[PDB]
Amino acid sequence: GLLKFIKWLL
């Protein structure tokens, strides 16, 4: 979880 949202943010 979580990492996918950060990959979008990046």
Ligand X SMILES: CCCCCCCCCCCCOP(=O)([O-])OCC[N+](C)(C)C
Residues that bind ligand X (CB under 6 A): 1-3, 5-6, 8-10
According to DSSP, residue 10 is labeled -
**Least separation, in Å, of the C-beta of 3 and ligand X?**
6
| Number of helices and strands in the chain (H, E) | 1, 0
**Least separation, in Å, of the C-beta of 2 and ligand X?**
5
**Least separation, in Å, of the C-beta of 10 and ligand X?**
5
H-helix segments, 1-10: 3-9
